[PDB]
Design brief:
By secondary structure, the chain is mostly loops. It is built from 1 helix and no strands. Bound molecules: heme C (3 copies) and chromium ion. One of its GO terms (molecular function) is electron transfer activity.
C-alpha cells in the first residue's frame, strides 16, 4: 500500500503508508517484519495513533482524522 484509506460512518481516516513512511519509516509503527497493526476502534485510538502526532501536522485530537 501507499495511501491506505478507511471509510467510516462518521468521517474518514485516510491513512498513509508511503506518504507517511517518508517521515515515519515503517518501524515508526511496525517493528521488524510487518504484518498488521490490528486497527478498528480501540488501538487506533491509543498509542497506535495518539502518540506520533502531538508535534507535527497540527490537529491530533478530534478532527485530526475524522475530517470535521
Ligand atoms: C473524536 C475524538 C473522534 C471520534 C468521534 C471518532 N474518532 Fe476515530 N479512528 C481513528 C482510526 C485510525 C480508526 C480506525 C479505523 C477503523 O474504524 O477501522 C478510528 C475509528 C473510529 C470509529 C470506528 C468506526 C465504526 O463505527 O466502525 C469511530 C466511531 C470513531 N473513530 C470516531 C483515528 C482517530 C484519531 C487519529 C488522530 C482521532 C483523533 C480520532 N480517531 C478521534 C475520533
Ligand atoms: C493512525 C494509523 C494514524 C492516523 C489516523 C493518522 N496518522 Fe499520521 N502523521 C505523522 C506525521 C509526521 C504527519 C505529517 C507528515 C506526513 O505524514 O508525511 C502525519 C500526518 C497525518 C495526516 C495528515 C497528512 C497530510 O499530509 O496532511 C493524517 C490524516 C494522519 N497523519 C492521520 C505521523 C504519524 C505516525 C508517527 C510514527 C503514526 C504512527 C501516524 N502518523 C499514524 C496515523
Ligand atoms: C514501511 C514502508 C512500512 C511497511 C513495510 C509496512 N507498513 Fe504499515 N500499517 C500501519 C497500520 C495502522 C496498519 C494496519 C491498518 C489497519 O488495520 O487499519 C498497517 C499494516 C501493514 C501491513 C499489513 C496490511 C496489508 O497491507 O495487508 C504491512 C505488510 C505493512 N503495514 C507494512 C501503519 C503504518 C504507518 C504508520 C501510520 C507507517 C509509516 C507504515 N505502516 C509503514 C509500513
Ligand atoms: Cr477516545
Amino acid at each position: 500500500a501507499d495511501v491506505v484509506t478507511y471509510e467510516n460512518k462518521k468521517g474518514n481516516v485516510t491513512f498513509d503508508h508511503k506518504a507517511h513512511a517518508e517521515k515515519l519509516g515503517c518501524d515508526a509503527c511496525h517493528e521488524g517484519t510487518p504484518a498488521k497493526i490490528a486497527i478498528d476502534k480501540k488501538s487506533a485510538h491509543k498509542d497506535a495513533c495518539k502518540t506520533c502526532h502531538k508535534s507535527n501536522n497540527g490537529p491530533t485530537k478530534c478532527g485530526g482524522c475524522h475530517i470535521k
